Amino acid sequence: AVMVQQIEGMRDIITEKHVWHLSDKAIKNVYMFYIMFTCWGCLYFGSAKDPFYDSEEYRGDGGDGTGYWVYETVCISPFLILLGKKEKNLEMH
């Protein structure tokens, strides 16, 4: 592993060169354990007290889990107050 390098410029070099590679099997092994960690984490952290998607801040206002519950909320609750306003005018407010 010892190589003495002769370069005229600065100094001599004592390069080691430990050529190595994670065994072919060990790459499958680290994939195996990481799929195990993914499995464990999916199960356990799905079984966790998820503090944002439980409260009346999210599930109360809208909160179906989509990305449009805000927009259908602010597009339907004004129609809800227009409906309530018409039903108010139906009894002469």
Residues 51-70 that bind another protein (CB under 8 A): 51-55, 57-70
Q: Is there binding between residue 91 and another protein (CB under 8 A)?
A: no
Q: Is there binding between residue 92 and another protein (CB under 8 A)?
A: no
Q: Which residues of 6-37 are buried (b: 16+ CB within 10 A; e: fewer)?
A: eeeeeeeeeeeeeeeeeeeeeeeeeeeeeeee
Q: How far apart, in whole angstroms, are the C-alpha atoms of residue 62 and residue 30?
A: 42
Cα of first residue to Cα of last residue in the chain, in angstroms, is 95
What part of residues 69-88 is at the interface with another protein (CB under 8 A)?
Answer: 69-72, 74-79, 81-86, 88
Q: Is there binding between residue 16 and another protein (CB under 8 A)?
A: yes
Q: CB of 93: closest distance to another protein in angstroms?
A: 7
Q: CB of 90: closest distance to another protein in angstroms?
A: 9
What part of residues 23-52 is at the interface with another protein (CB under 8 A)?
Answer: 23-52
Q: How far apart, in whole angstroms, are the C-alpha atoms of residue 8 and residue 4?
A: 13
